Amino acid sequence: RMYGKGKGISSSTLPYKRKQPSWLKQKPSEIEDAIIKLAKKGQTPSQIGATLRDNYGIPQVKSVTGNKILRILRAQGIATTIPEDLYFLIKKAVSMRKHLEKNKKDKDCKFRLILTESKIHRISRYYKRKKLLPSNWKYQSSTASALIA
Amino acid sequence: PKKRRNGGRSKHNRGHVNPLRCSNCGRCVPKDKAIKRFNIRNIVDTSAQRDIKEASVYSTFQLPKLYIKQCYCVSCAIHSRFVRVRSREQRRVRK
Amino acid sequence: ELVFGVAHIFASFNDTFIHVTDLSGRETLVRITGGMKVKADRDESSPYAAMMAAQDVAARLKELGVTAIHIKLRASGGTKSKTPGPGAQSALRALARSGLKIGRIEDVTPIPTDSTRKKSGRRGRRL
Amino acid sequence: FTKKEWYDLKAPKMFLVRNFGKTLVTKTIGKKLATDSLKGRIYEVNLADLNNDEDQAHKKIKLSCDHIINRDCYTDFCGLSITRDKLCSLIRKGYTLIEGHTDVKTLDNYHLRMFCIAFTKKRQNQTKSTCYAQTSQIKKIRKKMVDIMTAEASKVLLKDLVKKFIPESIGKEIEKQCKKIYPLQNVLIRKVKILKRPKLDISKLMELHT
Amino acid sequence: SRRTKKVGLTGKYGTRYGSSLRKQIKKIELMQHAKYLCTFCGKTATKRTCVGIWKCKKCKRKVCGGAWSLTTPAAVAAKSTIIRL
Amino acid sequence: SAGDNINAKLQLVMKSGKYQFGRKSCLKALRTGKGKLVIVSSNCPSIQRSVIEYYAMLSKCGVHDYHGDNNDLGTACGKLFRISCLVITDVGDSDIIK
Amino acid sequence: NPDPVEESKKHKLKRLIPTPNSYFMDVKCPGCLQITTLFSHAQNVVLCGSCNIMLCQPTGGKCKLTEGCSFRKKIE
RNA sequence: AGAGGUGAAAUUCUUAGAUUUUCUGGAGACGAACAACUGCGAAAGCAUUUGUCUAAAAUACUUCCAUUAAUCAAGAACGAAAGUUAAGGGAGUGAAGACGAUCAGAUACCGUCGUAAUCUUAACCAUAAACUAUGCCGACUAGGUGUUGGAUGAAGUGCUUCCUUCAGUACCUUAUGAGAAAUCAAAGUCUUUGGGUUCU
RNA sequence: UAUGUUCGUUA
């Protein structure tokens, strides 16, 4: 765990079966179209996979089609300029700052805001080390509120 | 050199425990460290029970009890003999 | 016929107030305490002082006509000490031997839900 | 003293004895009317002494002087509270005690603050030491108990509310409603106090004394 | 560049009057000369005109406020209690 | 999470559909009837707000009172200026219709 | 002896060979005879295909399901 | 007609009614009992109800990304109490001080009073035996009794208990493990000496 | 749970 304590080994473990499940008679000629429709209707890939798993019974998009969901979402040009986790961290930091500008006495909120901003900077450095973010991306704390886009 | 494993108190997973005040001397003592005796006593001794229960009415009147719940600092508890010094090995026995 | 008073007994490691009033608490009939019984500037909390305080409060109640008593016990206060003082024992003892009838007994010592700071420092009394 | 004289005390018709004792006054000489010296007198009277039963000995009712006629005083309900010994008996280590309070106005336009207490039950096959409840369960229990307080107090007059205090219908109902969430042992109205009462009406006082 | 290390706007007073007096007057002239948020137009353009009067440069609308800040905590809490009811 | 839902809906509307903000554009749009829904910021001057709702009820279009002021609405729409008035010419893939 | 261990199923997740405890199942409501796929440890509400009826409430685990229905493992 | 208070007293209050009893109104502080070798938090710390705002952690996951990580000079946020500044508050306690005692003396311990302080807001200060005197991350090594929070499976009466498991949190026994020993399940896996890292 | 101080230096 990056900050605080607690190992928290809670996670999801993929099955040994790396292939598409035998019982799935459905065809991958339209799974990508389904996720494309979901993304257009407006859904982040993290929860696109979840609604695909629950409401469509097609787990492991990587097994149904040989490609991962964010990859094919990019291949259709859908993917947003700011990735999942960076955007979620930005949103959380924005909410914290909005709370703080009203409650100046929330020292605990200030500490958590510093922690989440540190996480934002670490993740941003990684994502712009990859070409997944323009080299001038900075996360100005003044402009982050509208930066969500 | 670390007389007791628990340091003479019962604090774990905690940083600060609010103090109470000794019932005898009034000294501030952390609540987790104080010697606490819940004292449930008769109002009066057995002879005065016998006399009141005949001088009363209702012919079945039951004398109310007294719930005191004292808490003492280590010095006051030792002086009042609520706790003994105890030998090194018996020091680990708690019940 | 059985006429009732309320005897507020106050025992506080010093003199023992025996204070008999009517039912409402107002309109006090007789208060004796323990100071007027012993003239030693001390022993005011003694069971002997409380017994002598009670065995004349009984005579005055007998004269006043009151024949039964509701005992109402009090131990100093919310910040000083919760246990009734030494004289409480002999107070009800002598009230019982006095011959007047006794009803309900209750401990009405003021117990603070708060924790107003008690006297002495955080190091307590050193004597 | 010689110049004093006795007065008798009466209780409302919903009790049993209706004559719970005696009070005394000083001289009536002006300007001391020796009746304003009675009005607004509060008497702590045990339910056992009001109803000749040992079972309810742990409750005391406050009866307030409200009218003097000739030599007997009439009084009225002015609050109740359990006795300190019983309250301290109900409290044991290893259980969580849930306290609730509410302010409720009756149809008679009487404003009351009522405080109830409750504790958790061990039940049979637990084979543990503690019956602690989660804070969420405590909060739900307190909400339910406060809702019951206001519900079975705002739909009635004062007289029937006092009348149902005697058989503790509030406590049984709170047990029944909270059994579903966490089993509770003895829950009772710890204390009821009068916040505000309507203007005195000797008529309405009589239509409960008679 | 940075023209004063700490004296800020009180540099107008030079060395005169005590340092504590200058610091205390700084702490409130900072908020006296500030621009506040006009709740009527949403533009942060309301400045103090006279001791208790605050005018928005956009709406031209003026409100009664504190001596040195648009609102005072006492009146802010006072209004809040009324709004609660 | 009471106004966050419509903030998300509005963000998706900016992403997909086409819209217009400003008093003049809103009046023009729902005078020609092209308006679908109109957000009014809580800060909107009373005369302008009333003319807008009168216009919208004449043209049979919905009006939603935004929780925030013209700064909050401006940010919620992703812009760096105040809005105080918004018309959606067509809903994109947004459930803001219901 | 850790290779031919056989009661690793009762073991905690990520045992000698990590393997999810969840699965997938089909549901047949009696009097409805509907065909649709369901995920054990489902996370959101789910509806039927033939006649819309609530099927399982999403909890921290295997859901509460319904008082009836014939639910069958999809394993091969 | 005494009351406070003490080892015993006295200072102190007290026929102008003290203390004591009952009621009403105000005030500030505190939040007992429940309350625990319990919970939360980075630490300092956090305990009356309700609402709103905010965050975290554990668990469950066939959800997403795919090395984004560990520890870190500089630097930064927070940091008990006391103390400082400015308004407010000011009951109780009470560094100073003033008495009364005790003593050879007593400037102390004890008692009566009592200023600052203690509380609120806005700023400083940056220190505590700020202690489990034990840096952080990772792996391995053992039994049992508990307990806190999830999850799985099973059963007396829709309810209630047991099993398994994860994450906390303690405790007891054991060491042909360690240690100078006290002791330690980490302070072990160290002359059979090297997983990474910072500070001293 | 009143008061009760001190013991020159070296070997």
Automatic annotation (TrEMBL), chain B:
Keyword Magnesium: no
Any one annotated GO CC term: cytosolic small ribosomal subunit
GO BP of this protein: translation
InterPro entries per the UniProt record, alphabetical: Ribosomal_eS26 (IPR000892), Ribosomal_eS26_CS (IPR047864), Ribosomal_eS26_sf (IPR038551)
Gene3D superfamilies, A to Z: Ribosomal protein S26e
The entry's keywords: Ribonucleoprotein, Ribosomal protein
Highest taxon listed in the record's lineage: Eukaryota
One function term, GO molecular function aspect: structural constituent of ribosome
Disulfide bonds, paired cysteine numbers: 25-76
Record carries keyword Ribosomal protein: yes
Entry's transmembrane regions: none
Similarity-based family: Belongs to the eukaryotic ribosomal protein eS26 family.
Record-given protein name: 40S ribosomal protein S26
Taxonomic lineage of the native organism: Eukaryota, Sar, Alveolata, Apicomplexa, Aconoidasida
UniProtKB/TrEMBL annotation, chain C:
Keyword Nucleotidyltransferase: no
Localisation per UniProt entry: Plastid, Chloroplast
One GO cellular component, as annotated: chloroplast
GO molecular function, one term: structural constituent of ribosome
Signal sequence range: none
Span list, region Disordered: 106-127
Similarity comment: family membership: Belongs to the universal ribosomal protein uS11 family.
Name used for this protein in its record: 40S ribosomal protein S11
Source organism phylogeny: Eukaryota, Sar, Alveolata, Apicomplexa, Aconoidasida
Full-sequence range covered: 25 to 151 of 151
Automatic annotation (TrEMBL), chain F:
Pfam families linked: Ribosomal_L7Ae
Biological process terms in GO annotation: translation
Keyword terms, alphabetized: Ribonucleoprotein, Ribosomal protein
A GO CC term attached to the entry: cytosolic large ribosomal subunit
Transmembrane segments: none
SUPFAM superfamilies named in the record: L30e-like
Molecular function terms from GO: RNA binding; structural constituent of ribosome
Occurrences of domain Ribosomal protein eL8/eL30/eS12/Gadd45 (ranges): 4-97
Family of the protein in this entry: Belongs to the eukaryotic ribosomal protein eL30 family.
Protein name according to UniProt: 60S ribosomal protein L30e, putative
UniProtKB/TrEMBL annotation, chain G:
Cofactor(s) essential for the protein: Zn(2+)
Keywords: Ribonucleoprotein, Ribosomal protein, Zinc
UniProt name for this protein: 40S ribosomal protein S27
Organism of this sequence: Plasmodium falciparum (isolate 3D7)
UniProt GO MF annotations: RNA binding; structural constituent of ribosome
Taxonomy of the source species: Eukaryota, Sar, Alveolata, Apicomplexa, Aconoidasida
Any Gene Ontology CC annotation: cytosolic small ribosomal subunit
Family per record: Belongs to the eukaryotic ribosomal protein eS27 family.
Record-level GO BP terms: ribosomal small subunit assembly; translation
Pfam family, one: Ribosomal_S27e
Keyword Zinc-finger applies: no
